[PDB]
Design a protein around this ligand. Structure first.
Ligand SMILES: Nc1ncnc2c1ncn2[C@@H]1O[C@H](COP(=O)(O)OP(=O)(O)OP(=O)(O)O)[C@@H](O)[C@H]1O
Ligand SMILES: Nc1ncnc2c1ncn2[C@@H]1O[C@H](COP(=O)(O)OP(=O)(O)OP(=O)(O)O)[C@@H](O)[C@H]1O
Ligand SMILES: Nc1ncnc2c1ncn2[C@@H]1O[C@H](COP(=O)(O)OP(=O)(O)OP(=O)(O)O)[C@@H](O)[C@H]1O
Ligand SMILES: CC(C)CCC[C@@H](C)[C@H]1CC[C@H]2[C@@H]3CC=C4C[C@@H](O)CC[C@]4(C)[C@H]3CC[C@]12C
Ligand SMILES: CCCCCCCCCCC
Ligand SMILES: CCCCCCCCCCC
Ligand SMILES: CCCCCCCCCCC
Ligand SMILES: CCCCCCCCCC
Ligand SMILES: CCCCCCCCCC
Ligand SMILES: CCCCCCCCCC
Ligand SMILES: CCCCCCCCCC
Ligand SMILES: [Cl-]
Ligand SMILES: [Cl-]
Ligand SMILES: [Cl-]
Ligand SMILES: [Cl-]
Ligand SMILES: [Mg+2]
Ligand SMILES: [Mg+2]
Ligand SMILES: [Mg+2]
Ligand SMILES: [Mg+2]
Lengths: 328, 1183
């Protein structure tokens, strides 16, 4: 109650502070090593790094300036940098340093050794309902935090969710986050996770993240997305139709929650209603969830990745326009 | 299959139902074809309605503390229900105010009422408009209410089926096929019709409040004298309904037991024929019938008194309210006739419409509560799913089927790609271990861990309707390479070649067309074709010869799936040699676990798992007047009762005519004396009502007729030849023994009563009026002709549509039966959505016919009312214009004729309903006309000459020109490959198929004596064991011939004493679900006990020891030596050890029998078969 209401306001007050007075040019590539290549991506490339003056291992995301200007998306990559250094939450990947050279752009994150949720979901096949609920609670808390600041996340998918040593979720890839207070008309994201109003080419608001959460929960519980067609143009017809069928092993509470989250009529979708984010919290599916213990990280995770050192990366797979960029 | 024209029809076309004209035009001239049936509207699809209802039910469960299904239904269908209620009410309000307009018109014929004659034209215009507005308000509302009710029923049926597949294994023992078939059959048609009746529970009080105020202004305070009489009559009916409900609730329980016994006995008809048990089964069924028919008669007696209230109140309601008025001052005839006119509507509202609505609410809410109770039963728990386990571990598992634990501290561990061999004696718990692994039997202690992807092969072979290929593929994508490899590995390639249609031969429910080993190998092929991590094979080599068994084991289990983890239940030592681990059970305890060494001290590449739910022409193909006279003359008492009723009717007509011809507190003048006939017609419904001296015997005899017909139907079914019975389906038999019998018992007797009552009223009124004034009959003739012509036109298509709808109910029951039989296989493989889609297809098939039937019925009713309205308008205007300065004599005749036609219309609707109900009688008679199939045994000498056997008259011959002889008192061994024809010869001895040739026993030809005498000379052990619901003693001897001493002695000899004493009631324990509490071998021992109990001189044994271990086989060997000393035994068996105690051998190959003397001579010729003999038997056969 009051503890949630008093505490949010302080987060807002702190967020604006770092939004106004930021810091830039924290580090250049002299103290960074080049060990591994953790990920890929359609824009960047992420590789493992260590600081030899401290010894701590870090991740570093490298973006191409020319590619960025070629892809006709320049504001997104600057807004990513702007947002990542301002937010502060235990389920968000933090930022340490920022780079600025003549060729590329680099950022320094914390290292999350447990690998993606996607790989473990495909390895195990599907999660049980308590296992899925453990992660869904964290995602609900993260969206409650973000929407308090008028921030849309707008890219939710298993490849963006990482597992840390304790088994908790870490959210990354803020490439499409935007400070919207009102409406927006940009079409971006992964087609299976897009809301109907995004496809219909009309203004949309922060309600899209709850549709993405419903799709995420469905995919965790079943192992395959609710809207699956071989062609992107055919996926849109299934999304606009909004007709889903549930696996026989789904419970009634899960089906009711997913029906209320995957609601085509955005005036009837959970989280956008008069109660805000309390229809989700008070739902019968979350009856056995302790929202304080989850936030304080005192609940034992159902899965602990077997990390074997700071330099170990076994959980992962084996792998100029200076005018526009004036905020790095 | 065309589109429904309702979707693209105009507003005016939909309002008048003109879009039904093409099918009526088509069906009147010639027989309806398959293309005439239209595709159902999108709103009526089972998928959409199921989603609609399921959403609300899940919200109800997730958001309420006491969930109610009526709330879920209310949030789906309320505002359309209340929408049509308003127009139904507005069409009823019109009915109450008609006497205000028509009474002033009738009064204008009298020259005295000069005021009414000044405004008669405007009154006629108003009445003409009132008819038009009434006819347009009623029928569309009734059709909409029917449509809502049909949608509700479809949604509830879908939810019930989706719940059925989730029921736990512990709660399933308490639910039979009869209970579910009753739950669906009762609500099938009446639930849709009830939605139209429901609204009068509030319409009728308002109609009474209006009519009492209208009657009050005629009779100031005297109307309440009749109001109190109607109140007392309403309380009387409210008391009768409760007794009816009590009797129905008591009766409800016996029908399920009758249905389950009937279905069990019909599906095992060949065993019943072989045992000659038909009369005993008939005796049990008629004992069950006799109990419930008393409750049926009592409920019919109550319903008669409920139904006759309307007719026996027409005179007293007006008399009690007019007499206190007429005494204090005189009354004119006009006021009496107006009182009658209002009292007709008052009586119809009070004694007909209100109690029916109350009863409809009772039935609907009771059905909804029962369905809600079904939807909240305990469910099956889904297994843990984890692809990264690759290890099957069991530790300290103890379990109970409830006492003694079935499993007691079992431990084992097997890795990826290994084979486990489970062995043990009969009843050790080998099947229970696989049930525990599958999750169907929850352990009370211990843990079981594995990936969760399993494939299962049951010890009882389950076969679903469809082709062999559909059985093997079992609802996934067809892959040609794996299909060919699996077919070749399972040795099915030879048997498929014999079939004329190759792999696409259509199999029925249960696959009775196949042999035992063919069904076993098809089940094994279905198991192997599926991609899984763990394979559970429950004794697949039970009905296979040694050579086929060896080939399958060497090329399918150890080679084709050598990289898969698998558990094999087996007793053979050769199979134990190649197993990595061995587990031996003994009374549920781990007798041994370890390796055999210490005992003696590519196709699965593709992911095929990755229908349509609508009906096409192929699905519809299956669905495609001396009946009254035959129904009446079944029972002579019905003829006597009808003659009695006719004589009393004629006496009443004569008395009423004399009294009327014979013609103060009542004022009558010469110019107003015409009201006598109007009052007589108004009160004739009471002077001609059938009292309890006529009403009760009629219903009693009508119930007796249905009893006789059910007995004849059962007798005819049990006597039919096997060729006829194989083509029948389980769902059709259940349909015809449930729905038609229920209709003949409940609906028909009380509907015929109302039809006869209405006919008598109309005929008596017409005759009495026309005798004293012949111009009324001339006026009534054309309207009668019009109604008869329209009825004749309509019935041509109505009867065909009704027959189609009646035939469309079978696939639903067939799917329900086959779904209950194979539930564990469905949950093991994971094919629930496939069967849900098939059930939706069946529901859509039924809806396609039912919707058209209802639409054409509505069209007919609206046309009848329109004809009546147009005749009334014409005669009204003629009457008003014709009258001049004096008496208007034409209008009197015309208006009285129309007043009679008003009742004729209701009689015609009752006739249509009776004709609708008579289709069930037609189907029952069609089932009765099935064709009929039709000391001496001292030594047992048999002689056969030129015997030919074939299953279809004019088909392929399985055996050709068989000839051999048997000496008296000799054991003969009958051996051969699976599917060669060993069972066909034994069926040919009993003449269970089309046979040609000659067989003699001790010189007596089989054409000399009757078939019943011939079959009584044989004792049999069928390959398929038949067990019905009943005690042990009843199963052992249904005829109740032998005392418990003899039964206990035989059970001790056979080794059943320990098994029987396991259960609470020793020899009194009721066996349910075909002896589900017994093991597979205990059923073999039950059959052995049955064969021992009946002392016969010739014994036809069909593999007596199929699945038994070598230790238990000693019981059969000892019984053969001792109990059957001086008997001719023909022992058909695959066990090699059983051939030691034989003196003659018969081998079936290439469709003919070869005869051998010694087993060594037999074996030395067919080397390949001799190489398959195990070493333990090889030393025995070659000492
Ligand atoms: N802090 C981190 N620790 C470990 N791995 C990380 C970290 N941050 C990113 N990665 C890896 O990099 C991968 C892709 O990087 P990221 O998604 O940030 O780039 P992107 O181009 O925005 O991708 P997208 O195509 O989703 O836009 C992630 O899936 C993850 O494997
Ligand atoms: N549904 C049941 N309810 C109660 N007892 C049962 C039930 N099913 C089996 N049993 C009992 O469990 C015991 C073991 O039976 P089970 O069918 O598992 O034997 P089995 O080793 O597979 O036999 P067989 O060799 O005949 O196939 C028997 O004593 C049997 O009576
Ligand atoms: N009702 C039937 N209609 C048509 N063909 C049938 C019918 N019953 C059996 N057959 C066919 O008769 C042939 C011989 O089968 P039969 O059951 O007589 O053999 P079997 O030697 O007793 O078999 P098994 O060892 O499997 O018990 C098979 O090809 C089978 O398909
Ligand atoms: C459907 C219902 C609620 C409609 C209204 C019902 C009541 C109020 C109506 C129905 C019939 C009506 C009566 C009809 C005829 C007369 C005679 C007139 O000389 C005085 C009014 C009087 C006595 C009316 C009083 C009101 C009345 C009793
Ligand atoms: C549903 C309202 C019907 C009103 C009927 C009024 C009748 C008035 C009769 C006056 C003598
Ligand atoms: C439902 C309306 C009926 C109107 C009847 C009017 C009767 C007028 C009689 C004038 C003497
Ligand atoms: C059951 C309700 C009946 C209402 C009758 C009202 C009579 C009104 C008379 C006014 C003089
Ligand atoms: C005095 C003329 C009365 C006319 C009455 C018309 C009634 C029309 C009812 C629909
Ligand atoms: C059907 C109503 C007949 C009424 C007869 C009343 C007779 C009264 C005599 C005083
Ligand atoms: C078709 C019937 C017409 C009958 C008319 C009779 C009139 C008789 C007047 C006394
Ligand atoms: C219901 C019969 C109608 C008969 C009409 C006769 C008209 C005669 C006009 C003189
Ligand atoms: Cl009047
Ligand atoms: Cl009148
Ligand atoms: Cl009056
Ligand atoms: Cl009046
Ligand atoms: Mg990403
Ligand atoms: Mg991105
Ligand atoms: Mg068994
Ligand atoms: Mg056989």
């Amino acid at each position: 109650q009051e503890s949630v209401k008093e505490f949010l306001a302080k987060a807002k007050e702190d967020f604006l502070k770092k939004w106004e007075n930021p810091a830039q040019n924290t580090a250049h590539l002299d103290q960074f090593e080049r060990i591994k290549t953790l990920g890929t991506g359609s824009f960047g490339r992420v590789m493992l790094v260590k600081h030899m003056e401290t010894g701590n291992h870090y991740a570093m995301k490298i973006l191409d300036k020319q590619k960025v200007v070629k892809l006709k998306q320049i504001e997104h990559t600057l807004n990513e940098k702007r947002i990542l250094q301002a937010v502060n939450f235990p389920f968000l990947v933090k930022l340490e340093f920022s780079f600025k050279d003549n060729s590329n752009l680099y950022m320094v994150m914390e290292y999350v050794p447990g690998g993606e949720m996607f790989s473990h979901l495909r390895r195990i096949g599907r999660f049980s309902e308590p296992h899925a609920r453990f992660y869904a609670a964290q995602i609900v808390l993260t969206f409650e935090y973000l929407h308090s600041l008028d921030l849309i996340y707008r890219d939710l998918k298993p490849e963006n969710l990482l597992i840390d040593q304790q088994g908790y979720i870490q959210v990354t890839d803020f490439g499409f986050a935007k400070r919207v207070k009102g409406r927006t008309w940009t079409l971006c994201g992964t087609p299976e996770y897009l809301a109907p109003e995004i496809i219909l080419s009309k203004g949309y608001n922060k309600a899209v993240d709850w549709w993405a959460l419903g799709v995420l929960i469905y995919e965790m519980a079943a192992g395959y997305p609710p809207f699956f067609a071989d062609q992107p143009i055919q996926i849109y017809e299934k999304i606009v139709s909004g007709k889903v069928r549930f696996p026989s092993h789904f419970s009634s509470d899960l089906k009711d929650l997913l029906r209320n989250l995957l609601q085509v009529d955005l005036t009837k979708r959970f989280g956008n209603l008069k109660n805000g984010v309390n229809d989700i919290k008070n739902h019968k599916w979350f009856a056995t969830t302790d929202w304080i213990a989850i936030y304080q990280r005192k609940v034992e995770a159902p899965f602990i990745p077997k990390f074997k050192g700071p330099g170990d990366t076994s959980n992962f797979d084996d792998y100029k326009c200076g005018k526009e960029f004036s905020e790095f | 299959m065309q589109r429904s024209p309702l979707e693209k029809a105009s507003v005016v076309s939909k309002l008048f139902f003109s879009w039904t004209r093409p099918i009526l035009r088509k069906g009147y001239r010639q027989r309806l074809e398959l293309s005439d049936i239209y595709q159902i509207p999108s709103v009526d699809s089972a998928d959409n309605l199921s989603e609609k209802l399921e959403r609300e039910w899940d919200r109800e469960l997730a958001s309420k503390k006491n969930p109610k299904l009526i709330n879920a239904l209310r949030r789906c269908f309320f505002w359309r229900f209340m929408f049509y209620g308003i127009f139904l009410y507005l069409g009823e309000v019109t009915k109450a105010v008609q006497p205000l307009l028509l009474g002033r018109i009738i009064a204008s014929y009298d020259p005295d009422n000069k005021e009414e004659r000044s405004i008669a034209i405007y009154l006629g215009i108003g009445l003409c408009l009132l008819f038009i507005v009434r006819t347009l308000l009623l029928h569309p509302a009734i059709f909409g209410l029917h449509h809502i009710g049909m949608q509700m029923r479809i949604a509830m049926f879908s939810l019930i089926y989706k719940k059925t597949l989730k029921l736990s294994s512990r709660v399933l023992d308490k639910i039979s096929i009869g209970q579910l078939v009753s739950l669906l059959s009762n609500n099938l048609n009446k639930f849709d019709e009830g939605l139209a009746l429901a609204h009068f529970v509030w319409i009728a009080p308002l109609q009474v409040a209006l009519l009492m105020g209208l009657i009050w202004e005629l009779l100031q305070a005297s109307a309440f004298c009749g109001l109190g009489f109607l109140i007392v009559l309403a309380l009387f009916q409210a008391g009768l309904g409760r007794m009816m409900m009590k009797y129905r609730d008591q009766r409800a329980g016996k029908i399920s037991e009758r249905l389950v016994i009937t279905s069990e006995m019909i599906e095992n008809i060949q065993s019943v024929k072989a045992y000659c048990w038909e009369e005993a089964m008939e005796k049990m069924i008629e004992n069950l019938r006799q109990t419930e028919l008393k409750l049926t008669r009592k409920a019919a007696y109550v319903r008669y008194f409920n139904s006759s209230a309307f007719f026996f109140s027409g005179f007293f309601v007006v008399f009690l309210s007019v007499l206190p008025y007429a005494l204090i001052k005189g009354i004119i005839l006009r006021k009496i006739f107006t009182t009658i006119s209002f009292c007709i509507v008052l009586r119809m509202a009070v004694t007909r419409q209100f109690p029916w609505a109350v009863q409809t609410w009772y039935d609907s809410l009771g059905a909804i509560n029962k369905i809600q109770d079904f939807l909240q039963k305990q469910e099956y728990k889904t297994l843990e799913y984890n692809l990264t386990t690759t290890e099957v571990v069991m530790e300290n598992v103890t379990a109970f089927w409830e006492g003694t634990p079935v499993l007691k501290d079992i431990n084992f561990k097997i890795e990826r790609g290994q084979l486990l061999a489970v062995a043990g004696s009969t009843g050790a718990g080998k099947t229970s271990l696989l049930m525990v692994i599958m999750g169907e039997l929850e352990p009370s202690e211990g843990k079981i861990k594995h990936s969760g992807r399993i494939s299962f092969c049951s010890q009882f072979s389950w076969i679903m309707p469809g082709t062999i290929k559909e059985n093997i593929i079992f609802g996934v994508s067809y892959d040609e390479y794996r299909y060919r490899s699996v077919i070749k590995a399972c040795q099915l390639e030879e048997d498929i070649s014999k079939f004329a249609e190759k792999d696409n031969i259509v199999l029925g429910e249960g696959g009775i067309t196949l042999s035992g080993g063919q069904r076993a190998r098809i089940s094994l092929a279905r198991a192997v074709y599926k991609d899984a991590d763990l394979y559970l094979l429950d004794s697949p080599f039970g009905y296979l010869d040694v050579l086929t068994e060896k080939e399958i084991f060497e090329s399918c289990v150890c080679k084709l799936m050598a990289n898969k983890t698998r558990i094999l239940v087996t007793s053979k030592m050769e199979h134990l040699k190649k197993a990595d681990k061995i587990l031996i059970l003994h009374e549920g305890s781990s007798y041994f676990y370890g390796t055999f060494s210490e005992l003696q001290n590519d196709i699965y590449s593709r992911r095929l798992s990755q229908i349509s739910e609508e009906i096409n022409e192929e699905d519809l193909k299956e669905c495609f007047w001396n009946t009254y006279l035959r129904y009446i003359t079944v029972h002579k008492s019905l003829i006597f009762v009808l003659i009695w009723c006719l004589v009393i009717f004629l006496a009443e007509v004569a008395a009423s005519l004399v009294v009327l011809w014979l013609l103060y507190a009542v004022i009558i003048t010469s110019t107003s004396s015409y009201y006598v006939f109007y009052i007589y017609v108004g009160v004739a419904d009471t002077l001609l009502a059938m009292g309890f001296f006529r009403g009760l015997p009629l219903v009693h005899t009508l119930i007796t007729v249905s009893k006789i017909l059910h007995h004849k139907m059962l007798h005819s079914v049990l006597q039919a030849p096997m060729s006829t019975l194989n083509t029948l389906k389980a769902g059709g038999i259940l349909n015809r023994f449930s729905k038609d019998i229920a209709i003949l018992d409940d609906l028909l007797p009380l509907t015929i009563f109302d039809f006869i009552q209405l006919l008598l009223i109309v005929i008596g009124a017409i005759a009495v009026v026309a005798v004293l004034q012949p111009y009324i009959f001339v006026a009534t003739v054309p309207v009668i002709v019009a109604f008869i012509m329209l009825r004749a036109y309509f019935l041509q298509t109505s009867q065909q549509l009704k027959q189609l709808e009646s035939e469309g109910r079978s696939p639903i029951f067939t799917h329900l039966v086959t779904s209950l039989k194979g539930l564990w296989t469905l949950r093991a493989f994971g094919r629930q959505p496939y069967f849900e889609t098939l059930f939706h297809k069946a529901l859509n098939l039924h809806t396609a016919n039912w919707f058209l039937y209802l639409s054409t019925l509505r069209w007919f009713q609206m046309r009848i009312e329109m004809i009546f309205v147009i005749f009334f308008i014409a005669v009204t205007f003629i009457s008003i214009l014709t009258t001049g300065e004096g008496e208007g004599r034409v209008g009197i005749i015309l208006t009285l004729a129309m007043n009679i036609m008003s009742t004729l219309q209701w009689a015609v609707n009752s006739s249509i309903d009776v004709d609708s109900l008579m289709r069930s009688v037609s189907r029952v008679f069609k089932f009765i006309d099935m064709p009929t199939e039709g000391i001496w045994p001292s030594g047992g000498q048999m002689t056969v000459k030129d015997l030919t056997a074939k299953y279809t008259e004019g088909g392929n011959a399985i055996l050709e020109n068989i000839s051999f002889s048997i000496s008296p008192g000799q054991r003969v061994g009958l051996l051969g490959r699976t599917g060669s024809g060993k069972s066909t010869l034994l069926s040919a001895f009993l003449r269970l198929l089309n046979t040609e040739g000659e067989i003699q026993i001790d010189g007596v030809s089989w054409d000399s004596i009757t078939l019943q005498q011939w079959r009584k000379a044989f004792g049999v052990i069928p390959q398929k064991v038949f067990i019905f619901s009943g005690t042990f003693r009843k199963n052992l001897d249904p005829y109740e011939q032998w005392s418990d001493q003899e039964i206990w002695k035989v059970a001790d000899e056979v080794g059943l004493r320990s098994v029987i004493e396991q259960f609470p009631g020793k020899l009194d324990f009721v066996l349910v679900d075909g002896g589900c509490v017994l093991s597979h071998g205990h059923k073999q021992l039950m059959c052995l006990a049955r064969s021992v109990l009946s002392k016969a001189k010739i014994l036809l044994l069909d593999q007596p020891s199929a699945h038994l271990d070598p230790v238990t086989y000693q019981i059969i060997r000892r019984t053969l030596k001792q109990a059957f000393a001086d008997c001719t035994v023909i022992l058909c068996e695959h066990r090699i050890e059983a051939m030691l105690e034989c003196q003659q051998f018969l081998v079936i190959e290439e469709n003919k029998v070869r005869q051998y003397d010694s087993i060594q001579k037999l074996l030395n010729e067919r080397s390949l078969f001799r190489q398959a003999i195990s070493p333990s038997d090889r030393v025995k056969l070659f000492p």
